[PDB]
Amino acid sequence: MYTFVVRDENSSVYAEVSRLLLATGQWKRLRKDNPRFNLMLGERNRLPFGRLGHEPGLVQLVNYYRGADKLCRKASLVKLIKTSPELSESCTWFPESYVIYPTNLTDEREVFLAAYNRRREGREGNVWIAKSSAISSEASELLDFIDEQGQVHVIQKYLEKPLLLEPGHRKFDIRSWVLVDHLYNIYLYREGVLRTSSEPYNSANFQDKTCHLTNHCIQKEYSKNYGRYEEGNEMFFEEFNQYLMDALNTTLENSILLQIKHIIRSCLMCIEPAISTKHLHYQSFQLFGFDFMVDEELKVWLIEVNGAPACAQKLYAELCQGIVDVAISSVFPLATSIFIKLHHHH
Amino acid sequence: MRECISIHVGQAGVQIGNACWELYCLEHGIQPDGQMPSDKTIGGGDDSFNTFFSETGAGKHVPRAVFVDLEPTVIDEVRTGTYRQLFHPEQLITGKEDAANNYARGHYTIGKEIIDLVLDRIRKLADQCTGLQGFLVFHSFGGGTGSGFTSLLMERLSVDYGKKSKLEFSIYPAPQVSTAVVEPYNSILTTHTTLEHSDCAFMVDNEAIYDICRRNLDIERPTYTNLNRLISQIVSSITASLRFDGAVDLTEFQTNLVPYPRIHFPLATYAPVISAEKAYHEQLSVAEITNACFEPANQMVKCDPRHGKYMACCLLYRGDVVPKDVNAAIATIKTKRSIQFVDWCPTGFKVGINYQPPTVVPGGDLAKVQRAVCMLSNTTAIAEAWARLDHKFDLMYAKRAFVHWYVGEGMEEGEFSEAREDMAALEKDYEEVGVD
Amino acid sequence: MEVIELNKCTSGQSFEVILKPPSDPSLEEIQKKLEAAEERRKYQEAELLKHLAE
Amino acid sequence: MREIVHIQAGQCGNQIGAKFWEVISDEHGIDPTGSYHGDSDLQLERINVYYNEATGNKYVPRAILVDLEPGTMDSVRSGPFGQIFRPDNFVFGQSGAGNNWAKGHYTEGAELVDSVLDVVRKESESCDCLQGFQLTHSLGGGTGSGMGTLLISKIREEYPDRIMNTFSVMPSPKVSDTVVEPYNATLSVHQLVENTDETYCIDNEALYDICFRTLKLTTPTYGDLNHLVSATMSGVTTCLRFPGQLNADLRKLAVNMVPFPRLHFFMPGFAPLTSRQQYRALTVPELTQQMFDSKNMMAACDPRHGRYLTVAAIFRGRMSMKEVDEQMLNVQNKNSSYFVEWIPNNVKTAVCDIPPRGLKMSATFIGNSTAIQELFKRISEQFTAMFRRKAFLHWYTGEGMDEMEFTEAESNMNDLVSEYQQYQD
Numbered sequence A: 001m002y003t004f005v006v007r008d009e010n011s012s013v014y015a016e017v018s019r020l021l022l023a024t025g026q027w028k029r030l031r032k033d034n035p036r037f038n039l040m041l042g043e044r045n046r047l048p049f050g051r052l053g054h055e056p057g058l059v060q061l062v063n064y065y066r067g068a069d070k071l072c073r074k075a076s077l078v079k080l081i082k083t084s085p086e087l088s089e090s091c092t093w094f095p096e097s098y099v100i101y102p103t104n105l106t107d108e109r110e111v112f113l114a115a116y117n118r119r120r121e122g123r124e125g126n127v128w129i130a131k132s133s134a135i136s137s138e139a140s141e142l143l144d145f146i147d148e149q150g151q152v153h154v155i156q157k158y159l160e161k162p163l164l165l166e167p168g169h170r171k172f173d174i175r176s177w178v179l180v181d182h183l184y185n186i187y188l189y190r191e192g193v194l195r196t197s198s199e200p201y202n203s204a205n206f207q208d209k210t211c212h213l214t215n216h217c218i219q220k221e222y223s224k225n226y227g228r229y230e231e232g233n234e235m236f237f238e239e240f241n242q243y244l245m246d247a248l249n250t251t252l253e254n255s256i257l258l259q260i261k262h263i264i265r266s267c268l269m270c271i272e273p274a275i276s277t278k279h280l281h282y283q284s285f286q287l288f289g290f291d292f293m294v295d296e297e298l299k300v301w302l303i304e305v306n307g308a309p310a311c312a313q314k315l316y317a318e319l320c321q322g323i324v325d326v327a328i329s330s331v332f333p334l335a336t337s338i339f340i341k342l343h344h345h346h
Numbered sequence B: 001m002r003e004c005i006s007i008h009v010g011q012a013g014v015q016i017g018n019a020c021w022e023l024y025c026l027e028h029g030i031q032p033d034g035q036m037p038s039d040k041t042i043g044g045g046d047d048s049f050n051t052f053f054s055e056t057g058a059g060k061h062v063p064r065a066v067f068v069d070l071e072p073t074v075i076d077e078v079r080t081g082t083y084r085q086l087f088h089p090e091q092l093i094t095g096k097e098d099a100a101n102n103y104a105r106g107h108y109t110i111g112k113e114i115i116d117l118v119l120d121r122i123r124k125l126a127d128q129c130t131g132l133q134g135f136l137v138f139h140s141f142g143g144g145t146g147s148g149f150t151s152l153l154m155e156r157l158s159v160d161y162g163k164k165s166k167l168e169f170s171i172y173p174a175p176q177v178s179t180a181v182v183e184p185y186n187s188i189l190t191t192h193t194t195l196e197h198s199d200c201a202f203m204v205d206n207e208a209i210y211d212i213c214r215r216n217l218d219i220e221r222p223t224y225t226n227l228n229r230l231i232s233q234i235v236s237s238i239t240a241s242l243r244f245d246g247a248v249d250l251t252e253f254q255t256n257l258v259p260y261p262r263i264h265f266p267l268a269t270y271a272p273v274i275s276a277e278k279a280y281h282e283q284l285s286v287a288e289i290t291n292a293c294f295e296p297a298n299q300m301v302k303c304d305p306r307h308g309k310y311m312a313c314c315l316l317y318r319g320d321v322v323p324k325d326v327n328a329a330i331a332t333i334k335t336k337r338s339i340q341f342v343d344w345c346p347t348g349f350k351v352g353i354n355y356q357p358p359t360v361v362p363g364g365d366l367a368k369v370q371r372a373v374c375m376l377s378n379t380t381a382i383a384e385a386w387a388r389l390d391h392k393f394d395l396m397y398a399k400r401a402f403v404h405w406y407v408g409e410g411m412e413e414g415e416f417s418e419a420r421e422d423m424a425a426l427e428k429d430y431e432e433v434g435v436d
Numbered sequence C: 001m002e003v004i005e006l007n008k009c010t011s012g013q014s015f016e017v018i019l020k021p022p023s024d025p026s027l028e029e030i031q032k033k034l035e036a037a038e039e040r041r042k043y044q045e046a047e048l049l050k051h052l053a054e
Numbered sequence D: 001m002r003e004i005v006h007i008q009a010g011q012c013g014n015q016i017g018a019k020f021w022e023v024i025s026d027e028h029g030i031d032p033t034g035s036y037h038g039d040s041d042l043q044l045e046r047i048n049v050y051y052n053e054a055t056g057n058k059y060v061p062r063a064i065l066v067d068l069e070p071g072t073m074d075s076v077r078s079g080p081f082g083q084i085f086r087p088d089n090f091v092f093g094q095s096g097a098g099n100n101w102a103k104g105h106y107t108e109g110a111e112l113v114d115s116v117l118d119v120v121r122k123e124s125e126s127c128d129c130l131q132g133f134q135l136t137h138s139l140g141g142g143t144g145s146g147m148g149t150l151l152i153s154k155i156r157e158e159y160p161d162r163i164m165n166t167f168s169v170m171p172s173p174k175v176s177d178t179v180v181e182p183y184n185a186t187l188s189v190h191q192l193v194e195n196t197d198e199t200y201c202i203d204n205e206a207l208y209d210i211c212f213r214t215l216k217l218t219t220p221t222y223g224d225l226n227h228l229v230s231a232t233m234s235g236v237t238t239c240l241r242f243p244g245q246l247n248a249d250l251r252k253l254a255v256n257m258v259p260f261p262r263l264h265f266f267m268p269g270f271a272p273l274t275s276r277q278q279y280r281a282l283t284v285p286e287l288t289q290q291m292f293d294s295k296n297m298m299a300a301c302d303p304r305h306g307r308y309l310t311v312a313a314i315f316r317g318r319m320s321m322k323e324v325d326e327q328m329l330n331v332q333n334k335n336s337s338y339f340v341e342w343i344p345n346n347v348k349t350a351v352c353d354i355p356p357r358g359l360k361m362s363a364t365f366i367g368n369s370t371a372i373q374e375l376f377k378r379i380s381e382q383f384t385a386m387f388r389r390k391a392f393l394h395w396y397t398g399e400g401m402d403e404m405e406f407t408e409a410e411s412n413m414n415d416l417v418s419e420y421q422q423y424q425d
């Protein structure tokens, strides 16, 4: 009889995992402060990693890798890409980004202006975007908007030529879910989702950000065509695969999946020696939400990586059962995989 | 030549000291009766080993050590053991009833009565030193005498020996080998009153030594013998530079490893630990044993140095080790490991090579190796050990459990929260220096 | 990768390799703490004996 | 040399104490005459803890036998090991206590106590370093109940910083001498709450049920019940009488088992308990399930009705210490709800190499659980059922007590129950 605890009541993903574990009759849930647990579904912030792996006779497993915030924090990811040789500053699938600190606080302000002035002089598109974990073609507006805030921000090249779906002439992003187990096998969930925009993309008006941001909460609040083309502005790999064939005469595997699989591998392999729980006194596993952009040349770009992602309402059952199968049951065995293993060198 | 006095306090300190001085004799070729054929200067000399042994007119080499325990059962073993002839009676001090795992009982109730006697015995050794450097205090965090009397002895040492350095070898309490439930209280009580008085303290988590014994030595249920025989290896390698001609003085330990005073808790790493019962093993290269210094499985305290920041790193090599191979492995490891130094400190390594390889106790558990390295590193990841304890402390103190046993000995309940507020600050100090 | 202060002798040698440059209470008081604790012990034991004589 | 002074008062006290000394005498290789005849030195390693050494290499139990009537102590002196006891250590009167706590505590006992203490002092004066005292007695009688608590009070006065543990037999309605036992038990318990460091609660109903339901004894006897109390008393003391990494004195043990001063009441357990299939070897798992089973516990309290503050398991025999550690670590995770989570690592295990006579291996259980309140509730219920109507009170008021002292002993034990209740949540 295995035991586990729950320290994040807001987690929709692991609210179902705990539900499934109990349904097995072989797992028992304890109070959130009881330390005799085989598994911990821990809190997002300030998770006490230092207290794990020190219970005699108990193999302990946690659902967060210590150090993955380097990959999921906007300002942390930019720093990991430019400074890591495996990725290099010349990484071809990540938009040219810069870490800007508000003037009320290194910082890449001058390095950003240099690249910004270079574009303005070459008649090239120069529409950037500022964001933070907490759109404009003018450098003054972007830098002034950051000074009006008080946290770290990032200015990265806004993709001015995004692949637009028809009918609609609309933008979108792709969410892929990757599960990394204790042995550090990289499993890609065969099921992805496209969080699309229900408004015709407009390159002459970045002021109205409803046709530029594909977030599920912004579309269901400020967009007037929510749910017109697909339910909940969410299209799945089967329909998107069929549209690619009819319109572009290609496939999702060849056109986009191959690049996504490469991006996933490249990022997780880069920080493997830094978060691997191979020779550690406890074991880790984490589910990642990767967000991609696809331009009009069928090139896949990396947006960000979410360390505590939610899932599409239709995929909660299949994905969660797979977490238990390959992530939890693989360490605590009970009495065709929905994942695509991304083989690599450890 | 400058002398060093060792002070063993409590059950843990005495037994560990017994295992250390055993190794010291085998290393310096001193027989159980105290004779040393290799020493040609009879009755005197200022050699590298004289920092730890004194010489009599009869040629007996006597350790500069003192054993203290409020109970006579542990020190009686030394009085009749193989090495009984090494020490004289004045060096072994014992009471008649221990501190019952109660810090207050050792610090206030019993300590008061035996404190002036211990200091006087120490003064007798000090009266034999031509240039005393400091003291090496072995004790346990959980023991009532080890935690309670040590803290009092330290306070009095900083008074009677102001300018002398003091180093601790502290045993971090582990549940797998301890039957005591209050050791968190004692640990936090002793690290509080002892902080301002210790200049550098090496913690040994019994949890670490235990798994090192089961994993590397294939001992299903290890004993204190098995645990001490190992610890003395790590202690020997850390003290080897004081007894042999290699680099030298106790002042170097703080200067080299402790930039900020409160953060005087280095992390030790030792390799290779090979089982003598093994038929034969591939003699690990300098690169391999040096690469082992960054596996947590070889650390005296279990923690992740990849998620802290370093402040210093020494590599104490013993055996067949040459500088060319050390730098080769180092460059190899830098391009593979996660080693983050603080910005106010350089990113480098002090290295000392001693050509005589590590000595092993005959019939012991440790196999003879051709080259061994002990790394001393001041990581902020050792703050995990304080977090672990401070949590347990908080769990019980919230219900005031076991507090009456302490107050029953004259200690005030405020000394608990006072000691805890000090550990909360010590945890903050580490996070300030190590996190961004 | 700079090796410095290479020190050698017959029993061993020592050196330093750099990879990158940088960027008390008195005896009076102790006797009081000890006696004050012994005084609280005396008062608690007194209250015990008083309750026992009653 | 950490000597322990033993005391046994009253009929039950002396009879149980007697069998106890019979049990450990055999374990330490001491025959009925005081001579040593063992084949191992572990038997003499810690012999002075419970035995004095006389001329001719004789070992005399450091036991002081006390009673108001002579009946029982004449039995012991003519018992199997009777002649082993120091003839001076027999302190007894003639009036008897009439199964009345007042008589043993205030009147008949008051006249004999000073002579008992004279003997205690004589034994203490020869103890190189006295560990503390242990008392055997019942709480439903008058002598061991009334005078035993009186002795304890007078011992704490003369030796205030010495450990005072007791083995106390709780009266049950199933094995009852007199109807006033609830009066005597309640009056004794109040004394034990104040003046004892360890009190092992032994409910006769539990011993009975064990002898009946488990051991398959149709008609159990006070002699059958006492055999169990001999084995348990021998078990909880193995860490004291034999050498091991445990070490520990009476004070080191209490500090680690008693987190709150007045919650120092334990429910002991023994295992195996086998009916005469009696020669079958017992595996390390089987010792452990029974040990934590409620039927093998002697407090008539269901541990699943409370939470453990602390727990200590002492194993005896040639078994796998690795496998021992494995099984103990398994029980706690199976029943986590019954252990408090604010006392880290509150389950301790000790191993000894000498097994009890005739057993390949045994397990002694010591439990500081909050379920022990049910034992006190039963006592308090029976007590009030009588006291509300002042039934049988004249037997006590006649001896000099007032109704007020009864109302105090009532409230004091109901507070003890509430205390146990708050920590169970």
Ligand SMILES: Nc1nc2c(ncn2[C@@H]2O[C@H](COP(=O)(O)OP(=O)(O)OP(=O)(O)O)[C@@H](O)[C@H]2O)c(=O)[nH]1
Pocket: B009, B010, B011, B012, B013, B015, B016, B069, B070, B071, B098, B099, B100, B101, B102, B106, B140, B141, B142, B143, B144, B145, B146, B147, B171, B173, B174, B177, B178, B179, B180, B183, B206, B224, B227, B228, B231
């Ligand atoms: N590594 C190691 N740890 C020990 C040894 N002896 C005791 N310990 C640890 O010390 C802790 C208890 O402190 P002790 O040293 O035994 O107690 P003490 O210092 O004699 O003080 P008292 O309570 O008065 O006896 C336990 O957690 C043990 O794990 C030993 O020989 N080696």
Ligand SMILES: Nc1ncnc2c1ncn2[C@@H]1O[C@H](COP(=O)(O)OP(=O)(O)CP(=O)(O)O)[C@@H](O)[C@H]1O
Pocket: A095, A129, A131, A156, A157, A158, A159, A160, A171, A172, A173, A212, A213, A214, A215, A291, A293, A303, A304, A306
């Ligand atoms: N450089 C760029 N070019 C084009 N679009 C961009 C962009 N940077 C961000 N976006 C848009 O912003 C959206 C994602 O914003 P971002 O991910 O930074 O905020 P967020 O983290 O709160 C949403 P989530 O965590 O769910 O991915 C995407 O839908 C994308 O269309």
Ligand SMILES: Nc1nc2c(ncn2[C@@H]2O[C@H](COP(=O)(O)OP(=O)(O)O)[C@@H](O)[C@H]2O)c(=O)[nH]1
Pocket: D009, D010, D011, D012, D013, D015, D016, D097, D098, D099, D138, D139, D140, D141, D142, D143, D144, D145, D146, D169, D170, D171, D172, D175, D176, D177, D181, D204, D207, D222, D223, D225, D226, D229
């Ligand atoms: N287990 C056990 N209980 C006993 C024994 N003798 C008496 N009792 C219990 O003790 C109570 C009576 O106490 P008793 O010994 O007669 O009181 P005394 O006057 O002090 O000797 C009753 O509740 C009995 O159940 C015995 O030999 N074994």
Ligand SMILES: c1coc(CNc2nc3ccccc3[nH]2)c1
Pocket: D133, D134, D165, D166, D198, D236, D237, D239, D240, D250, D253, D254, D257, D312, D366
């Ligand atoms: C005489 C009076 O008490 C005794 C035995 N006490 C005792 N405390 C213990 C605490 C933990 C484990 C065993 C213990 N055993 C003998």
Ligand SMILES: [Ca+2]
Pocket: B039, B040, B041, B042, B043, B044, B045, B046, B047, B055
């Ligand atoms: Ca000499």
Ligand SMILES: [Ca+2]
Pocket: B158, B162, B164, B197
């Ligand atoms: Ca000083």
Ligand SMILES: [Ca+2]
Pocket: D095, D108, D111
């Ligand atoms: Ca009379």
Ligand SMILES: [Mg+2]
Pocket: A133, A304, A306
């Ligand atoms: Mg985000």
Ligand SMILES: [Mg+2]
Pocket: B010, B011, B071, B074, B098
């Ligand atoms: Mg001791």
Ligand SMILES: [Mg+2]
Pocket: D011
């Ligand atoms: Mg009778």
